[PDB]
Structure formats: C-alpha cells, structure tokens
Amino acid sequence: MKEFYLTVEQIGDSIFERYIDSNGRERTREVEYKPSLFAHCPESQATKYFDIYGKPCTRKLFANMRDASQWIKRMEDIGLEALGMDDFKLAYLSDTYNYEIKYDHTKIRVANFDIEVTSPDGFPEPSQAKHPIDAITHYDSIDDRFYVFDLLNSPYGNVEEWSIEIAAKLQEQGGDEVPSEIIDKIIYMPFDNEKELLMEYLNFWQQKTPVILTGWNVESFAIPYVYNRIKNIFGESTAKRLSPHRKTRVKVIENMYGSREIITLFGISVLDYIDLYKKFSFTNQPSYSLDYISEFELNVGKLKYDGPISKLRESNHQRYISYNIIAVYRVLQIDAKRQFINLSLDMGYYAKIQIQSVFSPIKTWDAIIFNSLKEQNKVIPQGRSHPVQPYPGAFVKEPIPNRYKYVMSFDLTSAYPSIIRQVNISPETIAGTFKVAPLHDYINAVAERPSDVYSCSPNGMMYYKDRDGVVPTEITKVFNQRKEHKGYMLAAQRNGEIIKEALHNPNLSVDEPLDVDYRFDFSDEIKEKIKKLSAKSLNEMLFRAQRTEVAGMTAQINRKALINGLAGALGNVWFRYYDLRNATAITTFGQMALQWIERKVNEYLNEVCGTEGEAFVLYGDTDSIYVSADKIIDKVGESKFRDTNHWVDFLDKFARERMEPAIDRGFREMCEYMNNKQHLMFMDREAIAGPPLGSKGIGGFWTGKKRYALNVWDMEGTRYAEPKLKIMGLETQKSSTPKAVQKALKECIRRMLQEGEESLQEYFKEFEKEFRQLNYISIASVSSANNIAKYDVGGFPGPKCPFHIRGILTYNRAIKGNIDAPQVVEGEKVYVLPLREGNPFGDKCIAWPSGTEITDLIKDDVLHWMDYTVLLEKTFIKPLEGFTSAAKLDYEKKASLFDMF
DNA sequence: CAGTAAGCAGTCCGCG
DNA sequence: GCGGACTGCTTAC
Numbered sequence: 001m002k003e004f005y006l007t008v009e010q011i012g013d014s015i016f017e018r019y020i021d022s023n024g025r026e027r028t029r030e031v032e033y034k035p036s037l038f039a040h041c042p043e044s045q046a047t048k049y050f051d052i053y054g055k056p057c058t059r060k061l062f063a064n065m066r067d068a069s070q071w072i073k074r075m076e077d078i079g080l081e082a083l084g085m086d087d088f089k090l091a092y093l094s095d096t097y098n099y100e101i102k103y104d105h106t107k108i109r110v111a112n113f114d115i116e117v118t119s120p121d122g123f124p125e126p127s128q129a130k131h132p133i134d135a136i137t138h139y140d141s142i143d144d145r146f147y148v149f150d151l152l153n154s155p156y157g158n159v160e161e162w163s164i165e166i167a168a169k170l171q172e173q174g175g176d177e178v179p180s181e182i183i184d185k186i187i188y189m190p191f192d193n194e195k196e197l198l199m200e201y202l203n204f205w206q207q208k209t210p211v212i213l214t215g216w217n218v219e220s221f222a223i224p225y226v227y228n229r230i231k232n233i234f235g236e237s238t239a240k241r242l243s244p245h246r247k248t249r250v251k252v253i254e255n256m257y258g259s260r261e262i263i264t265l266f267g268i269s270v271l272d273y274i275d276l277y278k279k280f281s282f283t284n285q286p287s288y289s290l291d292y293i294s295e296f297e298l299n300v301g302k303l304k305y306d307g308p309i310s311k312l313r314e315s316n317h318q319r320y321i322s323y324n325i326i327a328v329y330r331v332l333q334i335d336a337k338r339q340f341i342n343l344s345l346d347m348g349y350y351a352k353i354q355i356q357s358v359f360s361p362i363k364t365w366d367a368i369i370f371n372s373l374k375e376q377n378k379v380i381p382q383g384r385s386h387p388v389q390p391y392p393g394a395f396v397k398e399p400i401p402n403r404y405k406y407v408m409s410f411d412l413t414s415a416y417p418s419i420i421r422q423v424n425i426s427p428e429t430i431a432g433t434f435k436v437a438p439l440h441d442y443i444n445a446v447a448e449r450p451s452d453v454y455s456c457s458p459n460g461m462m463y464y465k466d467r468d469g470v471v472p473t474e475i476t477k478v479f480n481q482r483k484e485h486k487g488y489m490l491a492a493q494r495n496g497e498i499i500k501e502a503l504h505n506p507n508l509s510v511d512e513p514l515d516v517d518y519r520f521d522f523s524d525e526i527k528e529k530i531k532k533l534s535a536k537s538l539n540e541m542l543f544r545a546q547r548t549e550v551a552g553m554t555a556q557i558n559r560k561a562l563i564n565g566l567a568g569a570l571g572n573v574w575f576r577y578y579d580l581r582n583a584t585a586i587t588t589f590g591q592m593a594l595q596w597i598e599r600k601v602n603e604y605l606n607e608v609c610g611t612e613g614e615a616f617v618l619y620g621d622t623d624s625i626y627v628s629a630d631k632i633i634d635k636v637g638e639s640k641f642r643d644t645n646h647w648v649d650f651l652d653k654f655a656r657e658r659m660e661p662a663i664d665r666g667f668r669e670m671c672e673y674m675n676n677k678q679h680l681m682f683m684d685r686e687a688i689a690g691p692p693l694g695s696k697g698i699g700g701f702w703t704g705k706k707r708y709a710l711n712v713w714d715m716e717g718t719r720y721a722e723p724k725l726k727i728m729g730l731e732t733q734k735s736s737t738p739k740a741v742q743k744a745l746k747e748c749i750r751r752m753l754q755e756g757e758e759s760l761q762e763y764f765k766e767f768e769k770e771f772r773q774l775n776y777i778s779i780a781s782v783s784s785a786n787n788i789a790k791y792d793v794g795g796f797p798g799p800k801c802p803f804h805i806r807g808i809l810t811y812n813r814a815i816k817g818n819i820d821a822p823q824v825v826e827g828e829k830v831y832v833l834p835l836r837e838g839n840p841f842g843d844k845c846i847a848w849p850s851g852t853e854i855t856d857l858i859k860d861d862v863l864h865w866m867d868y869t870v871l872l873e874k875t876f877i878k879p880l881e882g883f884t885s886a887a888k889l890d891y892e893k894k895a896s897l898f899d900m901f
Numbered sequence: 902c903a904g905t906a907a908g909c910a911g912t913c914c915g916c917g
Numbered sequence: 918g919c920g921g922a923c924t925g926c927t928t929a930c
C-alpha cells in the first residue's frame with residue numbers, strides 16, 4: 001500500500017512524524033528536515049523557480065528549520081519579501097507525500113474517551129484538577145473495544161465493582177440498558193487506588209496511542225483535566241506521556257472576551273466532537289449537552305438518575321459507570337450517522353494538513369494552493385499584514401409583504417465558486433482595471449463593454465483569459481467532489497419519497513428490507529418489490545435511505561462550505577492571498593448577475609403573457625429569484641387540472657422547458673458582455689410552491705427580506721409524498737424561539753399555506769386556551785450569554801443590561817452562597833423566562849443553563865411566578881401578527897353581519 | 902478563527 | 918407608544 005502520514009509536528013529542528021508504512025504498520029520517525037525558502041533574483045540568473053507572477057526566484061536551502069525562520073526575520077529587517085511555505089511541516093508533507101494520498105481509515109487509531117470526576121464543591125476546574133478521576137471509558141477504533149477504568153476507592157467513597165450483568169438488564173429490571181451490541185466489547189478494569197488507575201491508563205495510552213482523539217468536550221474538559229491531575233500527582237514528565245513525543249504546550253484560546261486553557265498534545269490530532277458538530281452539522285442548538293444532542297440526533301431518551309451528579313457515584317456507582325460507558329457510545333452513534341470524522345480525514349488528507357487544521361479553511365486553502373503551485377515549480381508569496389476593512393456583499397431585493405399563491409424559485413449552482421471560475425478570479429490572473437460605471441448601467445446593459453481583451457467583473461477588475469488561475473483550478477476540483485456527493489444525497493432523498501409512498505399500502509407479510517445502494521435511484525424492479533413489502537421492512541428501508549441521505553449531506557454541504565470559504569478567504573486579512581479587489585470582484589459580479597437575470601426573467605415573462613412593466617420576480621437574495629406563477633396557472637385555468645400533482649408537473653415542465661432556456665440565454669449574453677472566460681452561471685429551478693388544489697390555503701407569504709414561508713411540492717427534483725414547508729428567517733427557524741412556540745407557529749403557518757384563514761383561527765383559539773399547561777422548558781426562550789461580568793454591578797443589572805443577562809443576574813442572586821447549584825457559564829446558552837410583578841426574585845426575568853432543569857431550590861418558585869401572558873405575547877402573538885398582517889389574514893375571527901341571528 | 906446583509910428584541914430616550 | 922441609535926443575537930445567503 002501507499003504510505004500516509006498520521007500526524008506531523010515541528011519540534012525545534014526536527015520534524016516528528018507518525019505514519020503508516022508500505023506494510024500498513026504504524027511507525028514514528030524523527031527527521032532533520034532542511035527547509036527551502038526563496039528570494040527574487042536577477043533575470044540573467046538561470047532558475048526553474050518562479051513566483052506566481054512569473055518573476056524568477058532563487059531557492060535557499062537551510063541547514064535547519066531555525067536558520068530558515070531566522071532568515072525570514074532578517075529579510076523583514078532588510079525590507080525584502082521572503083517567499084515560500086513558512087509552515088515547515090506543510091512543506092515536509094508536501095515533499096514526503098508528493099502524490100494524491102490514499103488513506104486507510106482502518107489503520108488510523110481513533111480514540112473516543114470520557115472521564116468522570118466527583119466534586120462536592122461545584123464544577124471541577126481542569127486547571128486545578130483537585131479531585132480524583134474516578135472513571136475513564138476509552139473506546140479504541142482499532143480494537144473496537146471500550147476500555148473501562150473504574151476507581152473503587154476514593155476520598156469521596158468506597159464502592160463495589162460495576163456489574164456487567166446488571167448493566168445489560170432493562171431499566172425496568174433495575175438495569176442500565178447498556179446496549180447489547182456493545183456488551184461484548186467492554187473490557188472492565190477496577191482499581192484499588194487512583195495512582196494505579198492513572199499509571200495503568202498511561203501504559204495503555206502508550207500501547208494504543210490515539211492518532212485522532214475525540215469525545216464530547218474533551219478539549220476543554222477531559223484532556224486538560226487528565227493532564228493536570230496526572231501533573232499534580234506525579235509531576236510534569238509523567239503528564240507529558242500523553243504526547244507520543246513527550247511535548248505539550250499550555251495554549252490560550254482568545255476571541256474577543258475572556259480566555260481559556262487547552263493542552264496541546266504534540267503528535268496527537270484532537271478533534272473534539274462538540275467542535276466537529278458545531279462546524280459541520282449546520283444546526284444551531286439551544287443546548288450542547290451530550291444528552292440534548294443525542295436526543296436530537298438519535299431520538300434516544302435522556303440518561304436518567306436521581307440526585308445530583310456529585311452524589312451519583314456514592315449513591316449508585318453501578319449506574320455511574322454504565323452512564324460513562326453509554327456517553328462514549330453515544331458519540332460513536334452520532335458519528336456513525338453524521339460521519340464528521342470521515343469528513344475530516346478526507347479533507348485533511350486532500351489538503352495535506354494536520355487533520356485538526358480542517359477547522360481552518362484559511363489553513364486548508366493555504367496548503368491546497370501551495371501543493372498545486374509547487375507542482376509547477378511555482379513559489380508562493382510571503383504572508384503580509386493588512387488592516388481589517390469592510391467591503392460590499394450580496395444584493396437582496398426588498399419584497400412587497402404579501403401572500404404569494406404560486407411561486408417558482410431558481411438559484412445559481414455554487415454561486416460564488418462559479419463566479420470565480422467564470423471570471424477567472426485569482427491572485428496571479430489580475431490583468432488590470434477598467435473605468436467603472438454605476439452597477440445599474442451594467443444591469444441594464446447600457447454601460448460601455450468593459451474590455452475586448454480581458455474577463456471582467458463590474459467592480460472594475462480585469463482578468464487574463466489565456467489560462468486558469470490556481471484559485472479557479474483548485475476550487476473546481478472541490479466543486480466536482482461536492483457535486484458527486486450532492487448527487488448521492490438527492491438520489492437517497494428521492495428514494496426516501498418512494499418508500500414513503502409505498503408505506504401507504506404496506507403488505508401483510510414477514511419479509512426483509514431489500515439490499516440496495518440508496519445513493520442511486522431505485523430501478524423499476526426495486527420499485528416493484530417495494531410495493532410488496534411489509535411496513536417493518538419499509539420502515540427499515542426508510543431509516544436506511546435517510547441515513548444515506550445524511551451521509552451525502554455531510555459530504556456535500558461541507559465541501560460547499562469549503563469552496564464558499566475560499567471566496568470568503570479572499571476578504572480575510574489572515575489569508576496569504578487576501579485581496580479586496582478579488583473579494584469585491586466576486587460580490588459585485590453577484591449583485592449584477594441577480595439583478596441582470598431579474599430583468600431578463602421579467603422581460604421574458606411579460607412577453608409570454610403579453611404584458612409590459614409587470615413584476616414577475618417578487619424576491620431574490622444573493623443568487624436566487626422567486627417568480628410569481630399565478631398568471632401561468634391562470635392561463636391554463638385551475639379547472640383544467642386533475643389534482644395538485646398535475647399543476648406541479650405543468651409548472652415543473654414550464655420551468656425546465658421555457659424558463660431555464662430563457663435564463664441560460666440571458667446569462668450567456670451577460671458572460672459575453674463581461675467577456676468572461678467561461679459561462680458557468682447555471683440557475684436551476686429550486687422550489688415549486690402553491691396551495692393544495694381546491695383548498696383555501698394561501699400557498700406562501702413574505703413579511704420582508706430573509707423572512708418567508710412557502711408550501712413546496714417539489715424541491716430540486718424531489719417530488720414529495722407530502723408537501724413540505726420551506727420557511728426561512730421566521731421564528732420557527734430560530735434557536736432563540738421556545739420549542740413549543742416554534743411548533744405552534746409552524747402549525748399556524750401550515751394552516752395558512754395549506755388550509756386558509758378559518759383553519760388558522762381554529763388553531764390559534766385552541767393554542768391560546770391550552771398553552772399555560774405547556775412544560776416550562778418548552779416555553780422558555782434561549783439566548784447565548786456573553787459579557788455577564790460587564791453588566792454585573794454588585795449582583796444587579798448595570799446600564800444597558802440585556803434582558804437575558806438580567807435573567808442570569810436574577811438567577812445568580814437566587815442561588816448565591818450555593819456551592820452545588822449549577823453556574824451559568826460565560827458564553828454558553830441559557831433558558832430565559834419572564835416573571836410576574838411582585839415575584840420573590842425581585843426582577844422581571846430569570847435565566848438558567850440551557851438544556852437543564854432549573855435547580856430544585858427555586859424551580860417551584862419560578863413555576864409559580866412564570867409570566868405566561870408576557871411569554872405568549874412576545875414569542876407567539878407578536879410574530880403571528882407579523883405573519884398574518886403580511887399575508888392579509890386575521891388570526892381571530894372579526895365580527896360580521898351574520899352574528900345578528 | 903478572521904465572508905456580508907439584514908432581521909427582531911431590548912435599552913435608552915426623544916417626541917411638545 | 919413609536920422610532921432612532923445602539924448593543925446583542927441570530928439567520929439567509
């Protein structure tokens with residue numbers, strides 16, 4: 001097999017590399033890597049190295065990495081550019097793996113661990129590590145085993161051994177329901193004392209040294225806790241054994257407010273699953289507890305126990321251990337679904353970076369572009385300092401707030417990356433500037449043609465047409481990967497809808513789910529067999545289809561994020577190729593394209609309908625248009641349609657056979673006008689939206705920019721078994737809106753769009769009458785809580801104190817002098833409730849940590865004083881009034897003359 | 902981390 | 918009470 005790196009570090013003048021050799025064995029080597037850097041030189045001097053602009057360079061080979069770093073400094077002191085890859089491990093990987101990396105995940109040791117620490121005096125701070133580690137569960141991907149290290153004797157209580165037999169039993173038998181599929185994979189090790197536990201853990205770690213290290217909050221909790229506890233008991237040298245090269249750094253994490261402490265283990269790649277989830281999941285969650293995320297992702301019940309966690313070990317050690325094991329398994333289950341570890345490996349190996357660098361698109365792109373340029377003996381420019389400067393972004397059309405009955409949407413495939421490729425936007429392809437006219441002159445095709453030689457953006461930039469830039473070249477490769485995975489995602493989705501249909505008529509049989517590849521559209525033979533399956537087999541197939549769809553989503557959406565991050569990186573002062581000329585070339589071309597095509601679509605539709613001046617495009621955002629199809633439907637007449645699916649077909653055909661050719665023609669003209677390198681503006685139909693045939697549903701509505709709802713029948717070629725709501729921006733979509741409120745508002749919207757005014761009034765009336773019964777958590781608002789200290793003035797709200805911070809301060813007073821009460825953590829999320837006048841908390845709201853029950857001390861008082869009226873008005877009624885006035889509907893029946901009888 | 906646009910909640914305060 | 922300036926937070930792209 002081909003070799004691949006596992007980890008790489010620079011330590012002084014050595015590269016330390018862990019790798020898989022040609023026999024699939026793990027090895028470690030220390031290499032005294034001699035880096036090269038580059039300086040411009042005279043033309044008269046023969047060389048094969050040129051910078052990205054074609055100026056000749058001489059290579060400088062250094063005796064060692066420190067000489068190279070010192071040289072960079074002296075070049076700054078002289079005032080001359082020091083060219084080449086200044087991150088020497090990236091140069092090392094590029095030299096050592098000068099081919100596309102084919103990796104084998106089965107040879108990569110992925111460790112997933114979690115620790116428990118009993119603490120009587122509040123949260124056990126990792127930087128102090130003053131309490132014994134009383135349990136570790138460490139799952140090893142190569143052994144496929146959960147290694148359980150269990151402390152039997154502690155100053156906080158001596159306990160009996162954990163029982164695997166009780167662990168396996170149902171909770172209704174008194175057991176812990178540790179899933180049966182892992183029972184045989186548990187290797188249980190009890191210990192008489194913490195020192196032997198930790199010594200054995202370190203010996204185990206030595207034998208099975210993680211390459212990828214993950215778990216839930218491991219970076220901010222488990223790793224620094226284990227490190228510091230070992231440090232405190234044994235000394236530094238012993239704690240450094242967590243690093244295969246015995247090197248660690250205490251690293252400070254700083255954004256804007258405050259700072260925390262993480263331990264960098266040299267030669268390990270830490271991918272904390274919480275950070276993987278935040279970067280790659282594209283959710284915003286009200287809470288990031290593992291119980292909360294597990295429930296959301298896996299539909300598994302909360303891990304339940306009596307009393308506080310600080311008393312759980314002594315009261316029920318059996319359950320204490322079982323829950324530590326389950327917690328480790330839950331992260332593996334989330335990963336089997338979401339496949340974020342697989343994604344990280346793919347992207348890391350593609351770029352040739354440290355795997356943990358996948359969190360940084362700047363570092364990812366820096367390395368991809370470096371490897372690409374190196375191939376052609378080209379030399380990358382030195383990174384420079386730039387002051388942060390604002391620059392313009394997308395255009396968003398102001399919609400007329402209204403109901404909109406029939407709507408078809410279109411938007412550009414991979415808009416920004418496509419602009420980059422079409423225009424040929426790249427550091428080395430800048431050809432010059434032209435004299436710019438106001439944007440509107442380009443939109444209306446009245447401005448002078450920018451160039452007869454170069455490819456242009458309406459921001460005034462011109463680009464070469466003779467050859468692709470490195471940015472277009474590399475962005476295209478990742479775009480193509482994205483496209484392949486999106487294809488699989490969409491096929492899985494369509495296949496899902498086939499199964500849902502079939503589920504209307506399940507067969508009364510005992511049979512099995514078909515063995516099929518859900519990434520490909522089901523053949524006719526598969527469809528026929530599906531129509532004969534039991535409900536059990538169909539449901540199993542649906543679950544499997546949806547799992548495939550999720551896997552495709554992870555792979556495609558994060559590749560989309562990476563390429564979109566390249567368009568962004570051009571406006572990031574930290575990027576090697578930062579250039580506001582290029583960042584603005586992209587955004588300004590986008591504004592033009594949207595408004596250009598708005599004009600073209602309006603002109604086309606006024607033509608087919610025989611009108612003038614009428615606005616068919618009602619909305620657009622960045623690269624999308626929403627076209628009113630009322631007139632199209634009305635031209636055949638609603639009476640002509642057999643059912644909903646019939647008009648959906650008709651509009652689908654109209655979009656494909658009339659709209660898209662017209663759109664393509666308009667964009668080809670724009671490409672010619674801008675003299676671009678390649679026409680790549682592909683604006684495909686997204687949504688077909690409307691009310692159910694013969695209903696009083698309104699179909700859709702807009703309240704304003706980035707705020708709308710549509711009843712959709714077909715999304716990007718997926719024809720739904722049941723209509724789906726596309727809601728953007730409205731409160732149903734915000735993590736800040738109470739759970740129960742999101743649900744009620746969504747049902748109100750469903751009724752509006754599918755059923756009409758009267759249905760809406762029925763549901764509102766019922767919701768208003770019943771809502772006081774809803775669980776307090778389900779009706780609590782949610783907010784991130786930053787700068788708690790800034791607004792805290794002796795425990796009371798300072799000037800301009802935000803509502804949610806006020807709540808926290810209320811909470812802090814209510815729990816003051818309580819060591820065991822959960823503390824609100826700076827920068828984390830809180831639930832927030834309003835309080836009625838004259839409550840014992842002495843303020844108008846309270847907040848507590850999100851994803852948790854409020855502490856029992858005050859729970860009963862919060863419940864007694866919760867202001868249901870304020871809650872209702874602010875979270876439900878106010879947004880609903882916004883929706884209904886926009887749609888010209890009433891959520892309460894108005895008096896009519898019929899009332900006289 | 903460190904792409905921009907733009908919505909709504911809330912504070913503070915004006916607005917005769 | 919609304920709205921304007923402002924802070925805070927959260928989406929849509």
Ligand SMILES: Nc1ncnc2c1ncn2[C@H]1C[C@H](O)[C@@H](COP(=O)(O)OP(=O)(O)OP(=O)(O)O)O1
Nearest residue numbers: 411412413414415416417564565568622623904930
């Ligand atoms: N998360 C993001 N980061 C940076 N730029 C973004 C992000 N989301 C959207 N954009 C910018 C770049 C996109 O090309 C453009 C249009 O957004 P959008 O339609 O969501 O994606 P897209 O056009 O790149 O992919 P798709 O093919 O799925 O439509 O807006």
Ligand SMILES: [Ca+2]
Nearest residue numbers: 115116324327
């Ligand atoms: Ca725990």
Ligand SMILES: [Ca+2]
Nearest residue numbers: 411412413414
């Ligand atoms: Ca798009």
Ligand SMILES: [Ca+2]
Nearest residue numbers: 411413684716
């Ligand atoms: Ca599309």
Ligand SMILES: [Ca+2]
Nearest residue numbers: 505507531532
């Ligand atoms: Ca059937």
Ligand SMILES: [Ca+2]
Nearest residue numbers: 411412623624
């Ligand atoms: Ca779009």
